[PDB]
RNA sequence: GAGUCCCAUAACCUUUGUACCCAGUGAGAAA
RNA sequence: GCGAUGAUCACCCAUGGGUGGGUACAAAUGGCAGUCUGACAAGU
């Protein structure tokens, strides 16, 4: 990808600012809280993902 | 003993179901002769009583009635009797129409006398629950939890949410908000409340109903007179008064 | 008006029976009452011939209602024996049907008989 | 409501991406965004004919 | 056969599409709980508890009007509050679908001349109260001019060569100004000596000679060979 | 000159008096063609002078048939003789505008001083008063005109087709569809009666297993008794009195309640078999050939599952669901039964003789095997 | 504080017991 | 002493035994299945 240098991108205009968000290093509470369902729900998730990527690649 | 409270309330549900499926076929069988009746009066027993009263449309033109169909649907049934897209039936099937109509009239008579029996057994088995939440509501509480002692040894939060188990356990097994009404939503006090305070008095009604219910199941010198249920109901009524008196508007 | 109403006279009857025989040779004829009502509700039928003298008559009067529903010409031949003999089978038939085909070598004859029985009907 | 759209939200995706469910079906090109008012219904095959669509 | 579809409103008011993996033209059911000619049904549970209301699949190979709808007609005049005069109500096949598209607040006058179809029409009009069955010949509208007043659309599924005269007589008696005239023309039943485009052009010319301005025609070809629906409006003054 | 106008309608007859003539030569023009749509200008043409309403739906159907086949009825004679002036028959007749060119001759046959006009001017005057309707009449009729139209259309159609409600198979559809419902209702209700009496002694449901007989005998036994003479409707009655002597199970209000429940079961039990006798009779008058061939209850369920007598008739014979040699007698009985239902539906007032012949044919076929 | 009136008054499955079974076709059948 | 008013039509053994099941139902405390929170709130 295009790696614009920090010396350039700190001195950019307000409209031309590059929104680059840092990765998260802390196991935050909402992520350690939030529940995912399993079994039939995870195979439903797998199925919907396979269907959607087959549709997008066909298009 | 209350092994037949469960039986009476299951018969009540089953029997109201069979009343509806008899009334539908009576309405669409007599609808060949007089079709506007089932749409201008919708009550099953008023429909059966009126076809037992008149029978035929010209017979309706010569007769009148006031003990059924009160005072304002008479001109509508007379106008629909004068002009109608309905045929004319014979006597050999008017006889079966009349037999079905008296059948479902006697069915509703049996329904209301079974409700009298349920009210009698309920106010002789757990009368403080009848004085607080009512006969058939307490009856399906007892019939839900099995035994009266098995309902009595349950906390008041369970008695609050007692009917709404599938909503409760889906809202616990994903981290959502639990229901607040359950089977106790059809109590008359929760009917009197309006807003979020019907959740509030579902809570206070379940608390006082737990008090009265385990008094009824665990007392030995109980008198079948409604005293503990009546003082608990007075507590719930003045609490309902004091949270219907407040208003979130600013005056 | 009888029940078996749109009966054909003798010239139309022999025109009908000749094209019935030719369609039976060309495998374009479904013969018999329930085969006729099968091909009628399937829609492969160009006209139905009922015979107006079988031993009940409502036994095939069930078919004019079906033809009316699907707009198919129907005509009454006055001999079940001659209708079966034209069909080419060794029994009397009471109803027969000319199925539709466009690789058919008698399409002009079938269309002419259809026009004649439709101006009758 | 959104409470019911969060229950039928997956088969609406299946109907939106019909075209890549079977490799032999090949629908005609529409877009089919989710309609504002819909209803989910079940086909009653009656008690007249058996064994074919049953 | 036991599958699940999503019901969606069509462009045309009163008719719907059930999307599955094959999508169905669908109408609401005015008499819920039975099928009229063996079509399949869809039962939705719409939200006192929710009520099971149901829907009927409109079969384009057994209905010229459904063949027209799903071939694509820019304007049907059969609408959910209207009055339709169905001419040639040959059974209750399409009249039931027109009836429950028109709805409980609108009226369908189903004119038929044969008598066993009339018996089935009356037994269907029992459970569909918005159908007035009229057993009479449409070639003489005066014989039933007393039973019908001021329709909004005429639909003509008659299959007779004097079609345009029947349509013109019934329109001049009972249709109102700028009302709908939907015609199902069958070329082979009008006449088979000329081709289909000649007979459609002649029938459209007959309609504008009887002052019904044609808006639209559709051949409805995958379902019927050599048919047509001509949609016009009864202009009554100034086709120009 | 189009001086008077006669509008027939389901509520009665109306005679209007034409105030202003519309244009004859400019009758196809745009303004003349839409002045009959505008009501504010149509009331400049037409004024109501008389409206004779009908005596009811009977006279409405009589006059609908007379207007349909082009005859002057007696109410027509009355209103025309009241309203139209006694003009000459040889010089300047009074001109009545009708909509029916073969009702005109019947009007001049009765009033020779009346010439009748139904050409395009009278046609669009007539459709003007049809287009406006209730507004012209100034409030003087009883009954909404469209409601009378629904009633008169249904009456006219059933008259024209000779719709009989005796041979009406919807009665036997609803009779057997209700009879199955009350089969399962008498079953579950007497099952609960046997359950509630099971702790009074659990042997009456062992000796007397039939629901009605159990319920009627327990409606009068409520105790011990001894005196076992009127409990035989006696080996089972003697065994029952022996079991009442050796009673081996356990009120008053609950026992009164289950007496009311068993009385309910008895009432359902004799409304059933009233309904069954009714539908055997209705099946003999509606489908005699089917009931001769396979019986009344079987033919009832056959035309119920088919949906109508007409649907069972128009069904193919190879697609009838009746209820080796045992495998093909079903097919023989199916196509003979389809034949019998066709006979029975499309004959107008059927006999029994072809059901008899088909019964003879199928018994010959089964006795051949 | 808090999703029942939207069928826990309900829905569905598996260890055992109860009854069948692996419509169309369209000219043959018998000797 | 025929008939279109309808003829016809999941594994081993030298009639019969041995090898899979399913559907349509009855139980069913194996099941799914597990009965929310807990100290403030209203007013002057």
UniProtKB/Swiss-Prot annotation, chain A:
It is found in: Cytoplasm; Nucleus, Nucleolus. Interacts directly with RCL1 and the U3 snoRNA to form a stable subcomplex. Component of the 90S small subunit processome also known as 90S pre-ribosome that consists of the 35S pre-rRNA, early-associating ribosomal proteins most of which are part of the small ribosomal subunit, the U3 snoRNA and associated proteins. GTPase required for synthesis of 40S ribosomal subunits and for processing the 35S pre-rRNA at sites A0, A1, and A2. Controls access of pre-ribosomal RNA intermediates to RCL1 during ribosome biogenesis by binding of RCL1 in a GTP-dependent manner and, via its affinity to U3 snoRNA, delivering it to pre-ribosomes. GTP-binding and/or GTP hydrolysis may induce conformational rearrangements within the BMS1-RCL1 complex allowing the interaction of RCL1 with its RNA substrate. Required for RCL1 import into the nucleus. Belongs to the TRAFAC class translation factor GTPase superfamily. Bms1-like GTPase family. BMS1 subfamily. This is Ribosome biogenesis protein BMS1. It comes from Saccharomyces cerevisiae (strain ATCC 204508 / S288c).
Swiss-Prot record, chain B:
GO terms for cellular component: 90S preribosome; box C/D methylation guide snoRNP complex; nucleolus; nucleoplasm; small-subunit processome. The keyword Coiled coil applies. Its main location: nucleus. It is found in: Nucleus, Nucleolus. Residues 125-245 form the Nop domain. There is a cross-link at residue 123 (Glycyl lysine isopeptide (Lys-Gly) (interchain with G-Cter in ubiquitin)). GO terms for biological process: box C/D sno(s)RNA 3'-end processing; endonucleolytic cleavage in 5'-ETS of tricistronic rRNA transcript (SSU-rRNA, 5.8S rRNA, LSU-rRNA); endonucleolytic cleavage in ITS1 to separate SSU-rRNA from 5.8S rRNA and LSU-rRNA from tricistronic rRNA transcript (SSU-rRNA, 5.8S rRNA, LSU-rRNA); endonucleolytic cleavage to generate mature 5'-end of SSU-rRNA from (SSU-rRNA, 5.8S rRNA, LSU-rRNA); maturation of SSU-rRNA; protein localization to nucleolus; rRNA processing; snoRNA guided rRNA 2'-O-methylation. Keywords: Coiled coil, Isopeptide bond, Nucleus, Ribonucleoprotein, Ribosome biogenesis, rRNA processing, Ubl conjugation. It comes from the Eukaryota. One of its GO terms (molecular function) is snRNA binding. Required for pre-18S rRNA processing. May bind microtubules. Interacts with SIK1/NOP56 and NOP1. Interacts with the trimethylguanosine synthase TGS1. Component of the ribosomal small subunit (SSU) processome composed of at least 40 protein subunits and snoRNA U3. Present with 34700 molecules/cell in log phase SD medium. Belongs to the NOP5/NOP56 family. This is Nucleolar protein 58. It comes from Saccharomyces cerevisiae (strain ATCC 204508 / S288c) (Baker's yeast). The chain holds residues 159 to 409 of 511 of the full protein.
Curated annotation (Swiss-Prot), chain D:
One of its GO terms (cellular component) is nucleus. Belongs to the FCF2 family. It is found in: Nucleus, Nucleolus. Keywords: Acetylation, Nucleus, Ribosome biogenesis, rRNA processing. GO terms for biological process: endonucleolytic cleavage in 5'-ETS of tricistronic rRNA transcript (SSU-rRNA, 5.8S rRNA, LSU-rRNA); endonucleolytic cleavage in ITS1 to separate SSU-rRNA from 5.8S rRNA and LSU-rRNA from tricistronic rRNA transcript (SSU-rRNA, 5.8S rRNA, LSU-rRNA); endonucleolytic cleavage to generate mature 5'-end of SSU-rRNA from (SSU-rRNA, 5.8S rRNA, LSU-rRNA); RNA processing. The gene is FCF2. Essential protein involved in pre-rRNA processing and 40S ribosomal subunit assembly. Required for the early cleavage steps of 35S rRNA at the A(0), A(1), and A(2) sites. This is rRNA-processing protein FCF2. Its main location: nucleus. Interacts with FAF1. The keyword Acetylation applies.
From Swiss-Prot, chain F:
The chain holds residues 3 to 415 of 504 of the full protein. The modification Phosphoserine is found at residue 308. This is Nucleolar protein 56. Keywords: Nucleus, Phosphoprotein, Ribonucleoprotein, Ribosome biogenesis. It comes from Saccharomyces cerevisiae (strain ATCC 204508 / S288c) (Baker's yeast). One of its GO terms (molecular function) is snoRNA binding. The lineage of its organism: Eukaryota, Fungi, Dikarya, Ascomycota, Saccharomycotina. Present with 13500 molecules/cell in log phase SD medium. Interacts with NOP1 and NOP58. Component of the ribosomal small subunit (SSU) processome composed of at least 40 protein subunits and snoRNA U3. Belongs to the NOP5/NOP56 family. Changing residue 320 to A: Reduced growth rate at all temperatures. The gene is NOP56.
């Amino acid at each position: 990808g295009l790696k614009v240098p920090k010396a350039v991108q700190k001195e950019l205009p307000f409209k031309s600012q590059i929104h680059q968000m840092k990765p998260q290093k802390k196991k935050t509470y909402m992520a350690k809280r939030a529940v995912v369902l399993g079994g039939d729900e995870k195979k439903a998730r797998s199925f919907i993902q396979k269907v959607l990527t087959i549709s997008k690649a066909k298009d | 003993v209350d092994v037949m409270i469960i039986q009476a309330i299951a018969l009540l549900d089953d029997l109201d179901k069979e009343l509806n499926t008899y009334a539908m076929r009576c309405k669409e069988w007599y609808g060949w002769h007089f079709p506007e009746l089932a749409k201008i009066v919708t009550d099953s027993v008023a429909y059966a009583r009126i076809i037992l009263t008149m029978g035929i449309r010209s017979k309706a033109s010569e007769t009148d009635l006031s003990e059924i169909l009160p005072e304002e649907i008479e001109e509508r049934v007379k106008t629909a009797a004068e002009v109608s897209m309905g045929t004319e039936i014979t006597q050999t099937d008017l006889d079966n129409i009349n037999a079905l109509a008296e059948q479902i009239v006697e069915f509703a008579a049996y329904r209301e006398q079974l409700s009298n029996y349920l009210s009698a057994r309920m106010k002789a088995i757990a009368p403080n629950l009848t004085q607080l939440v009512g006969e058939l509501v307490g009856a399906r509480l007892i019939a839900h939890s099995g035994s009266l002692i098995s309902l009595a040894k349950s906390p008041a939060s369970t008695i609050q949410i007692l009917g709404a188990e599938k909503a409760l356990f889906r809202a616990l097994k994903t981290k959502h908000d639990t229901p607040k009404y359950g089977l106790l939503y059809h109590a008359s006090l929760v009917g009197q409340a309006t807003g979020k305070n019907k959740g509030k008095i579902a809570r206070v009604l379940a608390a006082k109903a737990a008090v009265s219910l385990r008094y009824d199941a665990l007392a030995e010198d109980r008198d079948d007179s409604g005293d503990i249920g009546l003082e608990s109901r007075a507590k719930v009524e003045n609490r309902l008064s004091q949270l219907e008196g407040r208003d979130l508007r600013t005056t | 008006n009888p029940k078996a109403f749109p009966l054909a006279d003798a010239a139309l009857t022999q025109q009908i029976l000749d094209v019935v025989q030719q369609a039976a040779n060309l495998r374009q004829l479904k013969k018999g009452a329930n085969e006729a009502t099968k091909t009628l509700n399937r829609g492969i039928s160009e006209f139905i011939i009922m015979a107006a003298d079988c031993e009940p008559i409502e036994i095939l009067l069930h078919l004019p209602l079906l033809c009316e529903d699907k707009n198919v010409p129907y005509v009454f031949v006055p001999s079940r024996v001659a209708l079966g003999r034209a069909c080419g089978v060794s029994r009397p038939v009471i109803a027969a049907s000319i199925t539709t085909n466009d690789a058919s070598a008698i399409k002009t004859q079938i269309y002419a008989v259809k026009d004649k029985i439709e101006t009758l009907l | 409501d959104d409470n019911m759209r969060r229950e039928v939200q997956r088969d609406l995706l299946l109907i939106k991406h019909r075209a890549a469910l079977d490799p032999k079906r090949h629908y005609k090109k529409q877009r089919w965004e989710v309609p504002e008012r819909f209803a989910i219904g079940t086909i009653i095959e009656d008690k007249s004919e058996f064994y074919s669509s049953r | 056969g036991g599958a699940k579809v999503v019901i969606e409103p069509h462009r045309h008011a009163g008719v719907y599409i059930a999307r599955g993996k094959e999508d169905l033209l669908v109408t609401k059911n005015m008499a819920p709980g039975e099928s009229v000619y063996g079509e399949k049904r869809i039962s939705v549970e719409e939200p006192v508890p929710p009520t099971k209301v149901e829907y009927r699949v409109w079969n384009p190979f057994r209905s010229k009007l459904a063949a027209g709808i799903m071939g694509g007609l820019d304007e049907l005049f059969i609408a959910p509050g209207k009055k339709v005069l169905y001419l040639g109500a040959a059974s209750g096949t399409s009249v039931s679908h027109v009836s429950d598209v028109v709805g409980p607040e609108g009226v369908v006058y189903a004119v038929e001349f044969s008598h066993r179809p009339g018996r089935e029409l009356i037994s269907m009009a029992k459970k569909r109260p918005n159908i007035i069955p009229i057993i009479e010949d449409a070639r003489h509208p005066q014989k039933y001019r007393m039973l019908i007043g001021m329709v909004d659309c005429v639909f003509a599924d008659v299959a007779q060569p004097d079609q345009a005269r029947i349509i013109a007589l019934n329109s001049h008696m009972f249709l109102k100004d700028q009302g709908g005239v939907v015609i199902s023309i069958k070329a082979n039943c009008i006449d088979s000596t000329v081709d289909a485009e000649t007979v459609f052009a002649r029938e459209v010319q007959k309609l504008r000679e009887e002052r019904i301005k044609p808006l639209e025609q559709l051949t409805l070809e995958p379902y019927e060979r050599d048919h047509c629906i001509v949609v016009g409006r009864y202009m009554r003054s100034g086709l120009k | 000159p189009i001086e008077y106008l006669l509008f027939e309608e389901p509520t009665g007859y109306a005679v209007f008096k034409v105030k202003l003539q519309q244009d004859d030569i400019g009758s196809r023009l745009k303004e003349v063609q839409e002045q009959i749509n505008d009501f504010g200008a149509f009331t400049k043409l037409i004024e109501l002078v008389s409206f004779a309403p009908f005596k009811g739906a009977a006279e409405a159907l009589e006059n609908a048939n007379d207007i349909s086949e082009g005859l002057v009825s007696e109410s027509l004679k009355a209103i025309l003789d009241l309203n139209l002036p006694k003009a000459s028959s040889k010089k300047k007749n009074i001109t009545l505008a009708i909509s029916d060119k073969n009702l005109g001759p019947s009007i001049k046959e009765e009033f020779p001083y009346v010439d009748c006009i139904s050409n395009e001017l009278a046609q669009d005057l007539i459709r003007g008063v049809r287009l406006h309707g209730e507004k012209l009449f100034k409030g003087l009729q009883s009954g909404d005109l469209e409601r009378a139209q629904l009633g008169l259309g249904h009456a006219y159609s059933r008259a024209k087709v000779k719709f009989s409600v005796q041979k009406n198979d919807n009665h036997i559809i609803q009779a057997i569809a209700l009879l199955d419902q009350l089969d399962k209702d008498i079953n579950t209700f007497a099952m609960r009666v046997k359950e509630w009496y099971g702790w009074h002694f659990p042997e009456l449901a062992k000796l007397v297993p039939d629901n009605y007989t159990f319920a009627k005998l327990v409606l009068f036994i409520k105790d011990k008794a001894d005196d076992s003479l009127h409990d035989l409707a006696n080996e089972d009655s003697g065994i029952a009195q022996r079991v009442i002597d050796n009673a081996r199970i356990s009120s008053e209000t609950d026992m009164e309640n289950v007496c009311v429940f068993a009385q309910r079961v008895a009432s359902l039990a004799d409304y059933r078999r009233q309904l069954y006798d009714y539908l055997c009779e209705k099946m003999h008058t509606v489908a005699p050939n089917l009931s001769e061939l396979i019986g009344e209850v079987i033919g009832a369920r056959l035309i119920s599952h088919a949906g109508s007598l007409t649907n069972l008739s128009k069904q193919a014979a190879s697609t009838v669901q009746i209820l080796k040699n045992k495998g093909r007698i079903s097919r023989y009985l199916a196509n003979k039964c389809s034949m019998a239902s066709r006979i029975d539906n499309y004959s107008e007032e059927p006999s029994n003789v072809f059901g008899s012949v088909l019964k003879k044919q199928v018994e010959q076929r089964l006795e051949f095997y």
